[PDB]
Design an enzyme around this catalytic site. Structure first.
Site, short mmCIF file in Angstrom:
data_model
loop_
_atom_site.label_atom_id
_atom_site.label_comp_id
_atom_site.label_asym_id
_atom_site.label_seq_id
_atom_site.Cartn_x
_atom_site.Cartn_y
_atom_site.Cartn_z
N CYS A 92 0.83 -1.19 0.00
CA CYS A 92 0.00 0.00 0.00
C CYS A 92 0.87 1.25 0.00
O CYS A 92 0.70 2.07 -0.89
CB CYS A 92 -0.94 0.07 1.20
N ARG A 121 6.94 -11.18 5.37
CA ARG A 121 6.49 -11.08 6.75
C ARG A 121 7.22 -12.13 7.58
O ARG A 121 7.15 -13.31 7.27
CB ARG A 121 4.96 -11.28 6.82
N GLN A 139 0.73 -11.10 -3.17
CA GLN A 139 -0.69 -10.77 -3.17
C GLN A 139 -1.07 -10.27 -4.57
O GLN A 139 -0.28 -9.57 -5.25
CB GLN A 139 -0.97 -9.70 -2.12
N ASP A 141 -2.84 -7.77 -5.31
CA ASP A 141 -3.17 -6.70 -4.38
C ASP A 141 -3.65 -5.51 -5.19
O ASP A 141 -3.42 -5.44 -6.40
CB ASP A 141 -1.97 -6.42 -3.45
N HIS A 143 -4.91 -1.11 -4.38
CA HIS A 143 -5.52 -0.07 -3.58
C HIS A 143 -6.29 0.83 -4.51
O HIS A 143 -5.73 1.25 -5.51
CB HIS A 143 -4.43 0.65 -2.78
N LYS A 223 -11.49 -5.58 7.96
CA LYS A 223 -11.42 -6.44 6.80
C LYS A 223 -12.75 -7.18 6.61
O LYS A 223 -13.26 -7.74 7.57
CB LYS A 223 -10.38 -7.54 7.01
N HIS A 269 -8.26 -1.22 0.29
CA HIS A 269 -7.33 -2.30 0.01
C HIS A 269 -8.12 -3.55 -0.35
O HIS A 269 -9.00 -3.94 0.41
CB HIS A 269 -6.47 -2.64 1.24
C1 LIG Z 1 -4.69 -6.63 0.74
C2 LIG Z 1 -4.42 -5.27 1.34
O1 LIG Z 1 -3.69 -4.35 0.52
C3 LIG Z 1 -3.61 -5.25 2.64
N1 LIG Z 1 -2.44 -4.35 2.49
C4 LIG Z 1 -3.10 -6.57 3.21
O2 LIG Z 1 -1.90 -6.81 3.20
N2 LIG Z 1 -4.03 -7.33 3.83
P1 LIG Z 1 -3.79 -8.74 4.73
O3 LIG Z 1 -2.59 -8.71 5.65
O4 LIG Z 1 -5.15 -9.19 5.26
O5 LIG Z 1 -3.41 -9.82 3.62
C5 LIG Z 1 -4.32 -10.10 2.52
C6 LIG Z 1 -4.14 -11.51 2.05
C7 LIG Z 1 -4.65 -12.57 2.97
C8 LIG Z 1 -3.97 -13.79 2.42
O6 LIG Z 1 -3.97 -14.74 3.48
C9 LIG Z 1 -2.58 -13.22 2.10
N3 LIG Z 1 -1.58 -13.45 3.15
C10 LIG Z 1 -1.33 -12.64 4.23
N4 LIG Z 1 -0.37 -13.09 5.01
C11 LIG Z 1 0.02 -14.28 4.40
C12 LIG Z 1 1.01 -15.21 4.74
N5 LIG Z 1 1.80 -15.08 5.80
N6 LIG Z 1 1.14 -16.29 3.93
C13 LIG Z 1 0.34 -16.41 2.86
N7 LIG Z 1 -0.62 -15.60 2.45
C14 LIG Z 1 -0.72 -14.52 3.26
O7 LIG Z 1 -2.72 -11.82 1.95
ZN LIG Z 2 -2.99 -2.62 1.48
#
Ligand SMILES: C[C@H](O)[C@H](N)C(=O)NP(=O)(O)OC[C@@H]1C[C@H](O)[C@H](n2cnc3c(N)ncnc32)O1
Ligand SMILES: [Zn+2]
Ligand SMILES: C[C@H](O)[C@H](N)C(=O)NP(=O)(O)OC[C@@H]1C[C@H](O)[C@H](n2cnc3c(N)ncnc32)O1
Ligand SMILES: [Zn+2]
Lengths: 399, 400
Positions: A92, A121, A139, A141, A143, A223, A269
């Site tokens: 984002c 992450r 993602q 993804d 915005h 969300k 998002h």
């Molecule tokens: C989207 C928006 O822009 C916002 N910024 C955002 O990030 N949202 P959020 O943190 O809800 O994530 C969205 C999706 C959910 C799915 O599960 C995947 N995801 C997350 N951590 C994941 C992991 N550790 N392993 C796999 N998939 C993963 O991303």
């Molecule tokens: Zn986002």
């Protein structure tokens, strides 16, 4: 289980030298790339840009977003020349930097900005599970920058796009959740009341039954979560819609409104598939490795019985390759029955077999990974029908 | 200058909070994605797998490559759970990790493994220059795993591929270099002599004149460099072919020989465009922003004269969009020459003007970003000639 199927179909692997990191082999990278093509077919239709933000930015920018104080533990950091850098956990902030280049007016809104954006992450190693929970994922993804007035239609467009995309894959159990304000968040209570309400409203107008997950939204927004179920019926957050009145403010996003004043854009998002990794995991267990033809890593394998049909097999392979079919020749010096079994096990949708009678007639014996024997088919009829099954992204096959 | 044209065309931008890291805007990302599709067409033809390796691997793995010693300074590192990760400066070790899954035999070789592989290299900030020298870039990378018998043919294949792809862009000044052993290197002098000689023979056999560039090879192998030149005629290494008898062994690559012996494969490294970032900077300056139609972010702009023909422009825009063309409507309340000048600054190949004579006629008036006027033509003729000029990746426009 995707992790065993993923081994058997040579889709991906993982190792201790990189925990929670995926090595996409040819065959699973093909599935990934096909989901990209699919996603962009839908982006174009719903009118989105596609960008690419950098992989790291100054930790000063991440302090600005509150990601530093609210998300420090999840973030990888590196450095160069006394400057600290976060590897992006999220796309984002970098879309916001793109948006801040060039003066924007209400005539640029809604501005829908997508990215197949690689996030990293630092997930606890105890939480890691297969492709579903990884440390590095992409993602699908986006915005959306919009006005207050445009929120309803924009959030409805995201919801539509989830059910549209998911119907291609034929999911029975789509359980939706509304994740509300966590203890550590940005924005005023009023912003959170408005954002929580706008998403619940969106769900009720779209006739979507949902359950609260209290305290489970992001620090920067509540969300909508589209929840898919693996073969042991564990629930995985996939599709994701969030509503954010804080981030664009913190990153000095603005546009010139109709009245001709500076306004801060609202930011929606979403991720529709969620992450490519988790979605692929879900599909792999959903289909048990029997990917629909359009997704199948190798769609057709052409086998000669003897050396005698090999040049016919090569011509046919070229001819299908040119029609845009992911086809391989299998000209190995093996018994046909041994080659058929190999590719059946690999869940190749169609096996074409060439004996001398196929050569003479310019036909091909067709059979499927399901053990269906479709007999001898005209070659142009095989190409025509495969392209139909691929173009329409059909859930199941020639029978 | 690509940085000025970059901004003029809204392709990309860079910011102090990410030094040497590109923000690709929609328009520059379109060029990038179009080059990917092009490269994919050539991968398919030349029979390459396409894989994706992770951004991070344990530093223990990079120490094995000889990278901790030799590529020390350029690497970004990071931590998790008291373990240290290197953000990958190269795609090769990750390709080897994939190769080392499953048992391999000589029947698998040559195994060509491509990747659009995102590298991060902590280049000194004084050395950074636009898109050409960045800290984060994507190589149209591949590693070919082969026997010693297959080296001539596979090195020749990489050279063929370079000139194949570069002829699409119509490059004239391709200066070739052979970059020889650096002071800090892995491998024996024998492996270097064999590597440097094999690359020199490949070039010689293909009748490619070159020059040695002493001490410029990588620590893990010497390079053929296909050099391209920017506006100031500075030389930029783009196409890159390396021969590597050392990394496969350090990373425990083997395959079952025909002799039934275990054998270490030879690794050929090549990037054809080099990096997408550098190639796009080169192309930008090379064409001065007049990207061939296939590459242009917006290929066609359809503009009304008056508010009258708005609806006609909007259906034509729909129809061209359906026919797979990157097309925009320009319905702003501005005179035609004003709009033509703006879309010429944006380097839009074709500008389709619509007055009431075009509305009645089912036709369009075709102007080009080269100041030229191709008169009026049936819409379906324009669509077909556009698709043909896009499909063929033609350098030349209608006339031009
Ligand atoms: C989207 C928006 O822009 C916002 N910024 C955002 O990030 N949202 P959020 O943190 O809800 O994530 C969205 C999706 C959910 C799915 O599960 C995947 N995801 C997350 N951590 C994941 C992991 N550790 N392993 C796999 N998939 C993963 O991303
Ligand atoms: Zn986002
Ligand atoms: C390819 C093979 O597999 C091997 N592993 C490898 O890496 N080779 P090498 O180190 O010659 O790089 C190859 C190309 C040359 C081009 O210049 C681009 N590149 C490099 N640093 C770049 C920067 N800082 N900015 C932009 N492009 C850059 O990558
Ligand atoms: Zn390499």
């Amino acid at each position: 289980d995707h992790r065993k199927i993923g081994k058997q179909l040579d889709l991906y692997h993982m190792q201790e030298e990189a925990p929670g990191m995926v090595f996409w082999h040819n065959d699973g990278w093909t599935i990934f790339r096909e989901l990209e093509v699919f996603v962009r077919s839908k982006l174009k239709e719903y009118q989105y840009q596609e960008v690419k933000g950098p992989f790291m930015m100054d930790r000063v920018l991440w302090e600005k977003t509150g990601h530093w104080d609210n998300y420090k533990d999840a973030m990888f950091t590196t450095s160069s020349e006394n400057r600290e850098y976060c590897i992006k956990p999220m796309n984002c902030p970098g879309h916001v930097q793109i948006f801040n280049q060039g003066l924007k007016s209400y005539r640029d809104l809604p501005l829908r900005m997508a990215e197949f954006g690689s996030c990293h992450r630092n997930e606890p190693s105890g939480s890691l599970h297969g492709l579903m929970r990884v440390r590095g994922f992409t993602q699908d993804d986006a915005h959306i920058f919009c006005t207050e007035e445009q929120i309803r239609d924009e959030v409805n467009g995201c919801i539509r796009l989830v059910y549209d995309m998911y119907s291609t894959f034929g999911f029975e159990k789509i359980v939706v959740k509304l994740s509300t304000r966590p203890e550590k968040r940005i924005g005023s209570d009023e912003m959170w009341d408005r954002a929580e309400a706008d998403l619940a409203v969106a769900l009720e107008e779209n006739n979507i039954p949902f359950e609260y997950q209290l305290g489970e939204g992001a620090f920067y927004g509540p969300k909508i979560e589209f929840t898919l179920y693996d073969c042991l019926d564990r629930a995985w957050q996939c599709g994701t819609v969030q509503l954010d009145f804080s981030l664009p403010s913190r990153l000095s996003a603005s546009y010139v409104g109709e009245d001709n004043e500076r306004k801060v854009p609202v930011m929606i998002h979403r991720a529709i598939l969620g992450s490519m990794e988790r979605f692929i995991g879900i599909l792999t267990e959903e289909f048990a490795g029997f990917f629909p033809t359009w997704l199948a890593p190798v769609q057709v394998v052409i086998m000669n019985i003897t050396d005698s049909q090999s040049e016919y097999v090569n011509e046919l392979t070229q001819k299908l390759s040119n029609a845009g079919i992911r086809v391989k020749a299998d000209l190995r010096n093996e018994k046909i029955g041994f080659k058929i079994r190999e590719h059946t096990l690999r869940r190749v949708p169609y096996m074409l077999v060439c004996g001398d009678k196929e050569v003479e007639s310019g036909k091909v014996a067709v059979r499927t990974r399901r053990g269906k024997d479709l007999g001898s088919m005209d070659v142009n009829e095989v190409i025509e029908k495969l392209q139909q099954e691929i173009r329409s992204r059909s859930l199941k096959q020639l029978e």
